[PDB]
Amino acid sequence: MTIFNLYIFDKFGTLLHYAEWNRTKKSGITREEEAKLTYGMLFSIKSFVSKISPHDPKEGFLYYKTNRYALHYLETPSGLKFVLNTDTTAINVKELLQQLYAKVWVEFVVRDPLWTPGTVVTSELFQSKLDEFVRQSPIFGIRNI
Amino acid sequence: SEEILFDCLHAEIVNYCLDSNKEHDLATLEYIGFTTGYRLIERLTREVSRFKDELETMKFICTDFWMLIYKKQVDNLRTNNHGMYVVQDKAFRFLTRISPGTKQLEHAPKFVAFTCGLVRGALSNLGINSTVTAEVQSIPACKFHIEVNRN
Amino acid sequence: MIIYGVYIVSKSGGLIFNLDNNVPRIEHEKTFTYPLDLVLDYDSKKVSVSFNRKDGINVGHVLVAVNGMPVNGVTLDDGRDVRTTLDAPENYPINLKFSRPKMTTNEKIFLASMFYPLFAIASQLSPEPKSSGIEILEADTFTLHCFQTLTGIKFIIISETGLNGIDLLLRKVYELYSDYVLKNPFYSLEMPIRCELFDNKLQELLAQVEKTGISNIDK
Amino acid sequence: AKKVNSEFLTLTYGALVTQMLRDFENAEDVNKQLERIGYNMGMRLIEDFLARTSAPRCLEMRETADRIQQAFRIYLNIQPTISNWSPASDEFSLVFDSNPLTEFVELPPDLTNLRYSAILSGCIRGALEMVQLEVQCWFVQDQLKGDNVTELRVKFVRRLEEVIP
């Protein structure tokens, strides 16, 4: 029962890649507009907290939850965004996304000469390595702090 | 993690190729580089006495130079009788980052020049000569096809 | 356990009630010398800083009072403007008050307004099928817990981030809701609920939960 | 053996500078190529620097100085020492006793206007704009041009902000 999906968005708000494993609710929206909608929503939540914060939001937003699934968010200071869907309840995954960034992305993307900056990744090695790093802990559930 | 500089820099060289020449890359990189590595090679297996001339297969010296730079070993080493021969390597670092699917093949001559341009020795197969072509069939698998400067 | 604020919104999503539990914003003063490393930037009624958040003056710390004299939106109380005051040197060395903009009520209305869709559009195109929306949104230094009435009204409160056992507290605020809508069912969602009786009953629920007991369901 | 794994880089850089310099006669043209190529390189490098140092993000120039000198520590194995702050904290200076990326590239090439550290300037700026910090970069002192210490200068010009959701 592995993760549903995983999203990437640049500091300009463009969808880099979407990998799906177990998402089932078949989308009425073509994925690109959906990614745009999600990036805008996340931006909205950033503004939302940055206004209604009692004090400094050092890392600001963390994630949101539903009763029957959950989702988590990762912020990269360069402005790239990380989003994946998980189940509601298992270990946290903020760290797991940090790791995926610092290893899989920084290795199999930027250190790829044939990925031009700010486009869609289409590397079969980045694809397969994402597949395997997810298959590392195909764990579903978050209960994130 | 000092490699990242060189991976990015060689990547951007793979990027720009102005139409005047294919490989504007002169070999002074290779010359001064092997001289540096040989500053670190202040010892190599050749006898103290000058007359008894022993040649070091530049195949082996290429192995060692990779360990000094490319860090991963040359694997399949087929050699004809004379100075013509080849290396068959399953993995190549700059092509480790590209998809293994044999779809991006052109990026080799920047690779193969770097193993050319190493000054010769009078005794053949002594370990330093270089003039090399590449035929990368599979992406990680470079195929540096050697031709000595001599016959 | 300290609750920063309490809220409820309607089928419209309009902010029907926005009691705040007295959580002040940080303040700073320091005897400012020649032009300040605080990077002051004018942005549309905000006289703020964009960089060099030093000494506990956050970026979002809007200029609040100047040299004791209050400062209002862009200019000051006395008629001086922040720019003219600042860039004149010989006034220095001087004190400047700074703090964060307690979003005036109307701004809070706007905030609740813009948040409602996120509730109703919490990826309704979810992975999981026939899903359900948002309920829990953790954040940096607050955490949002909402209780859908399971049909209709939304119940969102703002609590200390590191805490559990609050959804039952939401159920009890739901009980207070029922208590009050007994008052006048004509007094419906359309008008907002500002009836000081039920409201001090809520502030007593607050009083109980400020003390230890959130077990001891007593409200 | 292997005091410096990447002394290779400086010779590659010397190859690139002389190749351009033969191609483009002007020190100015190669200055722009060095700057932009540093730009792309620093764009490549800043993300890895934030994968390792895992910095929150830079909201203050003292933080920016510490971060970038740390990157120099971890990328070029050098220890620049922050100094000469602006009264407004915009400028600060990075003290390179040995520009690591040069080992007697050439003291006289008979060519002023040919600045070497422009690659660093490009890297620092491209990195910074990845993290939403438009700061200009130049070089107040430079050993090669006759100085004793090579000193990069950056002054906080503008705070870029993400817009258009």
Author numbering:
A (entry chain C): 1 to 145
B (entry chain B): 2 to 152
C (entry chain D): 1 to 219
D (entry chain A): 10 to 174
Paper text:
The TRAPP complexes are nucleotide exchange factors that play essential roles in membrane traffic and autophagy. TRAPPII activates Rab11, and TRAPPIII activates Rab1, with the two complexes sharing a core of small subunits that affect nucleotide exchange but being distinguished by specific large subunits that are essential for activity in vivo. We report a cryo‐EM structure of the entire Drosophila TRAPPIII complex. The TRAPPIII‐specific subunits TRAPPC8 and TRAPPC11 hold the catalytic core like a pair of tongs, with TRAPPC12 and TRAPPC13 positioned at the joint between them.
Expressing TRAPPIII without the TRAPPC12 and TRAPPC13 subunits reduces its size by ~100 kDa, close to the combined weight of two subunits, indicating that their absence does not affect the binding of the other nine subunits. We reanalysed cryo‐EM images of miniTRAPPIII following a similar strategy to that used for TRAPPIII. We concluded TRAPPC12 and TRAPPC13 were located in this region of TRAPPIII, forming one of the vertexes of the triangle.
